[PDB]
Symmetry: C5
Subunit: 46 residues, 5 copies
């Protein structure tokens, strides 16, 4: 009653924030996999 539109707005914000977190992690996972491969192929390692 009356603040319901306020609650919905906060829900949309959380949703947007999660979208970001998600693109951030997909970017992170790709960099981490890059690191992995590279150390995996490091001469000095044997």
């Amino acid at each position: 009653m009356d603040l319901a539109p306020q609650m919905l707005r906060e829900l949309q914000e959380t949703n947007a924030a999660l979208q970001d977190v998600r693109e951030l992690l997909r970017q992170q996972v790709k960099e981490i996999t890059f690191l992995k491969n590279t150390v995996m192929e490091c001469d000095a390692c044997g």
Copy 2:
């Protein structure tokens, strides 16, 4: 009257995102664990 339908939609969307986040983190820890093991076996380190 109420915005239940809209709030539920946002909620469903949040959950879908979270499910992808949990899957991304699961994969990330795996890669990190693979990286860890590699380094431990890295000849130049000891």
Copy 3:
């Protein structure tokens, strides 16, 4: 249909998902700390 109960269900699913996220992060921190300590003892390093 009255949507209250469905909303409550999504929230509980959010919580479950977040409890998984916390445990993943928790394990993740432990692996990266281990990796760090490992690199600190990498003889080819400094």
Copy 4:
């Protein structure tokens, strides 16, 4: 019902926390990228 005010307060805290998380992840992606770029120009690797 009479719990709405407090529900909004919890929803707002969630968003504030989420923004912190987003901010920390963005910096994080930055540090991992620097790490990556360092492995690349690391004479003893590839």
Copy 5:
């Protein structure tokens, strides 16, 4: 009369959980940054 008390409970638990995740992420950034420098001063890199 409603499901609010139960809804409030879930919301409160989401927040408690996010608190841990941001705390965990804060600790992780710190480890990573340290790893970053350590690698930055690794003799074997050139």
